[PDB]
Amino acid sequence: VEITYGSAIKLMHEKTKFRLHSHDVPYGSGSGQQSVTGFPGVVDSNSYWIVKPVPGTTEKQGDAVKSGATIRLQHMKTRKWLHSHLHASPISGNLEVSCFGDDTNSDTGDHWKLIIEGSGKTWKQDQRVRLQHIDTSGYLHSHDKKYQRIAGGQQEVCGIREKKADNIWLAAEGVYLPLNE
């Protein structure tokens, strides 16, 4: 259950049970970058993310991710980074959450602080967490607000500034690399 750097995870929205999801299609407005949504179905390779450190650092694959760590989530299928910035999200006009760059292109807008809700010190499967975007201070957020025509039935994912029930997430369905000890 200990989630280590290098591990593959799904991230489930606690309230709606939808999974953090991406795919090879951009937003029409805001940044025009690759879009990110909440996806309800269980079988979906597009729901997998790799937990990574920021490139400068001592943290390595197999190290436990700590509460308070700055992390990156890289989409397995497209290699783009979970990203935010000051653009309007398409449904609710909150902070746009996108997929940015690739293996040669990452910036600080790819940085999220892991906040474990209890007194837990290392990230585990099924524990309640928030992810706070470093640059904007937006909490990764979803809700029962859905696209209709393209990607219909999938939920908006965005960033908001207050802690709420709709910004708690749980890591699930993961493959966790062995603990360096």
Name residue, tokens 């099924």.
Answer: 126
Structure tokens at 165: 């029930």
Sign of the CA dihedral running 162, 64, 21, 83:
positive
Tell me the technique behind this structure: X-ray
DSSP symbols for 119-168? S--B-BTT-EEEEEETTT-PEEEEEEEE--SSSTTPEEEEEESS--GGG-
User: What's the one-letter identity of residue 134?
Assistant: I
CB atoms within 10 A of CB 69: 21
Structure tokens at 73: 């989530």
Residue 161 CB coordination number (10 Å):
14
Q: CB count, 10 Å around CB of 137?
A: 13
If you ran DSSP here, which 8-state letter would residue 4 be given?
B
Number of residues assigned to the chain: 181
Residue 27 contacts by C-beta under 8 Å, 6 or more apart in sequence? 33, 34, 35, 90, 96, 98
Alpha carbon 2 to its chain centroid, in Å, reads 18
Among 117, 123, 165, residue whose Cα is nearest residue 142: 165
> What does the block give as tokens for 120?
């837990």
End-to-end CA distance of the chain: 14
What distance in Å separates the CA atoms of residue 12 and residue 149, rounded to the nearest whole number?
24
CA angle 18, 175, 139 (to 5 degrees): 40
Residue-range domains of the chain with CATH: 1-181 (2.80.10.50)
State the resolution, in angstroms.
2.0
Chain CA centroid to CA 15, Å:
16
Q: Which two tokens stand for residue 64?
A: 């436990």
Residues 164 and 172: their CA atoms lie apart, in Å, by 20
Separation between Cα atoms, residue 105 and residue 3, nearest integer Å: 25
What is the rounded distance in angstroms from the CA atom of residue 61 to the CA atom of residue 139? 25
